[PDB]
């Protein structure tokens, strides 16, 4: 809660999104392990893209945030929404068993 310190979180994520979205698309690595492959004038080394994938996993994981929030809501509001049929130490207490037993009472037939 406390939407004073909720905006101060949601203004640091826009920082990171508008800092990652100003990187050049022609970004590439040069590791110290391409010397063992003997790359010619035109040979297409196989470790050129170990930073541009990492600079898109962050940029697309920081846009799929309010999708995993909506999946976590559907998870928690269907695991905690039962809470008395799966957890063993709650469906064995006196009061929970008495309440579940007492909701199932069929109404009395007059005559």
């Amino acid at each position: 809660g406390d939407p004073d310190t909720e905006i101060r979180i949601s203004a640091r994520i826009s920082n990171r999104i508008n800092e990652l979205e100003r990187l050049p698309a022609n970004l590439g690595t040069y590791s110290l392990d391409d010397c063992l492959e003997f790359i010619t004038k035109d040979d297409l080394s196989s470790r050129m893209d170990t930073f541009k994938i990492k600079a898109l996993v962050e940029l697309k994981s920081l846009k799929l945030l309010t999708k995993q929030k909506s999946i976590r809501q559907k998870l928690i509001n269907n695991v905690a929404s039962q809470a008395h049929h799966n957890i063993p130490y709650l469906r064995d207490s006196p009061f929970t068993a008495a309440a579940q037993r007492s909701v199932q009472i069929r109404s009395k037939v007059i005559v």
């Binding site: 003997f38 010619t40 004038k41 040979d43």
Partner: protein, 37 residues
């Protein structure tokens, strides 16, 4: 040795292109570092 191995094989074999790539790599390796020296 690279001209010999080019003329020895046909133009489509893999040992033609390996000698071509090896010539390119070694000529690039020997053009630089005698510019430093």
């Amino acid at each position: 040795v690279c001209t010999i191995l080019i003329h020895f094989y046909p133009q489509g074999t893999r040992n033609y292109q390996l000698v071509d790539k090896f010539y390119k790599f070694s000529s690039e390796l020997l053009l630089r570092e005698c510019c430093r020296i």
